[PDB]
């Protein structure tokens, strides 16, 4: 959805996925420029438990449907 709203919500995400969506640790994925619909589905799937990862299930706990779309827009538009 809204890239700017996503930025506002990305401070925690940046600690692991990087300030510009490129991670510095090899087990944390890069998000910069990823497909927006794919990113949204992953966040939806962590929240629902469809994709089991204890760290990310925890990170999406407080995210609304709009928040996940917005975070996806923020990373997808990274160049």
- With CB under 5 to 8 Å by kind, the binding choice for 47 among its own copies, ligand HEC, none is none
- With CB under 5 to 8 Å by kind, the binding choice for 52 among ligand HEC, its own copies, none is its own copies
- Listed in sequence order, the DSSP H helices in 1-79 are 3-8, 11-17, 36-48, 54-59, 65-76
In the block, residue with structure tokens 């990087």: 18
What's the gap between Cα 37 and its chain centre?
11
Residue 58 or 79: the one with the smaller Cβ distance to ligand HEC is 58
Q: Check the annotation: does 17 bind a ligand.
A: yes
- Interactions with its own copies, residue window 19-58 (CB under 8 A): 23, 25-30, 33-38, 41, 50-52
């Amino acid at each position: 959805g809204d890239a700017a709203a996503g930025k506002a919500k990305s401070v925690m995400c940046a600690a692991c996925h990087g300030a510009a969506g490129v991670s510095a640790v090899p087990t944390y994925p890069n998000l910069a420029g990823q497909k927006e619909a794919y990113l949204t589905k992953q966040l939806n799937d962590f929240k629902s438990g469809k994709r089991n990862d204890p760290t990310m299930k925890g990170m999406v706990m407080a995210l609304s449907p709009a928040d996940m779309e917005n975070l996806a827009a923020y990373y997808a538009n990274m160049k």
